[PDB]
Design a protein around this ligand. Structure first.
Ligand SMILES: Nc1nc2c(ncn2[C@@H]2O[C@H](COP(=O)(O)OP(=O)(O)OP(=O)(O)O)[C@@H](O)[C@H]2O)c(=O)[nH]1
Lengths: 176, 74
């Protein structure tokens, strides 16, 4: 047994990672604050927002962390992954390089995250269809090849944004 | 080969052109054309035919050697 806060049953620490400009801050802001903006401020270090949700009648508190995607604020060893309950790997569906680097983000999870942490591949900017480069089938083939759930999304138009985070919260509850 | 046949149809040297026979070629044709491949880029790609073919064949031949250095790529 352990102490339990009356407001929330489960504290699920989520973490967003991915190349710069993939839309991690936009996704975090759209989910935790229903706001979006064209002004780009490159994240440094860490940021987090808390959002309380409900799934299967359980009050779930999500602490979603947004890590800096730029080369200069990244390091080989990382201690942000430590204690994450689930990790979202974001990529920009309009930039194949961000999708290719997903392979490299995954190996960071297998090295520093919890041994069986939940993972979720997210393809932000799905609203730029005239500029999209990856196929949904190309991503699904890759996500399923590793068993990680996947949802294409758009922070701009809220498209699947809520569902992406809600899905990982459910998956973590399923894990524990 | 498919693009070259489309060139013949484009320049009036053939009456009409069917869709590609193997779906992997149609999937690629769809990819290329949906990505904004203009007709002039098809003509230019066809001029680079020999280069792309030889180069692709040589790139593959290096991948056939990538097993010898698989440990250093990490
Ligand atoms: N069209 C479109 N543009 C988006 C979307 N999400 C983000 N953007 C654009 O991408 C820019 C950067 O978004 P960020 O969330 O700050 O990117 P990031 O992943 O946080 O990058 P870092 O903070 O450097 O790690 C935004 O200012 C928007 O211009 C989206 O869903 N659709």
């Amino acid at each position: 047994m352990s102490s339990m806060n009356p407001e929330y049953d489960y504290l699920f620490k989520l973490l967003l990672i991915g190349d710069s400009g993939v839309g991690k801050s936009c996704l975090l802001l759209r989910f935790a604050d229903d706001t979006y903006t064209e002004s780009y401020i490159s994240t440094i270090g860490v940021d987090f927002k808390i959002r309380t949700i409900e799934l299967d009648g359980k009050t779930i508190k999500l602490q979603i962390w947004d890590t800096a995607g730029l080369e200069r604020f990244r390091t080989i060893t990382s201690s942000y992954y430590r204690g994450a309950h689930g990790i979202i790997v974001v990529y920009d569906v309009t930039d194949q390089e961000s999708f290719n680097n997903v392979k490299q983000w995954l190996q960071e999870i297998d090295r520093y995250a919890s041994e069986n942490v939940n993972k979720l591949l997210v393809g932000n900017k799905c609203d730029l269809t005239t500029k999209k480069v990856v196929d949904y089938t190309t991503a699904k083939e890759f996500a399923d090849s590793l068993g990680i759930p996947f949802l294409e999304t758009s922070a701009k138009n809220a498209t699947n944004v809520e569902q992406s985070f809600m899905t990982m919260a459910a998956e973590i509850k399923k894990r524990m | 080969r498919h693009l070259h046949m489309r060139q013949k149809k484009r320049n009036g040297s053939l009456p009409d052109c069917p869709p590609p026979e193997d779906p992997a070629i149609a999937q690629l044709l769809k990819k290329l054309l949906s990505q904004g491949m203009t007709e002039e880029e098809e003509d230019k790609l066809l001029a680079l035919k020999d280069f792309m073919m030889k180069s692709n064949k040589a790139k593959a031949n290096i991948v056939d050697q990538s097993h010898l250095h698989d440990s250093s790529q990490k």
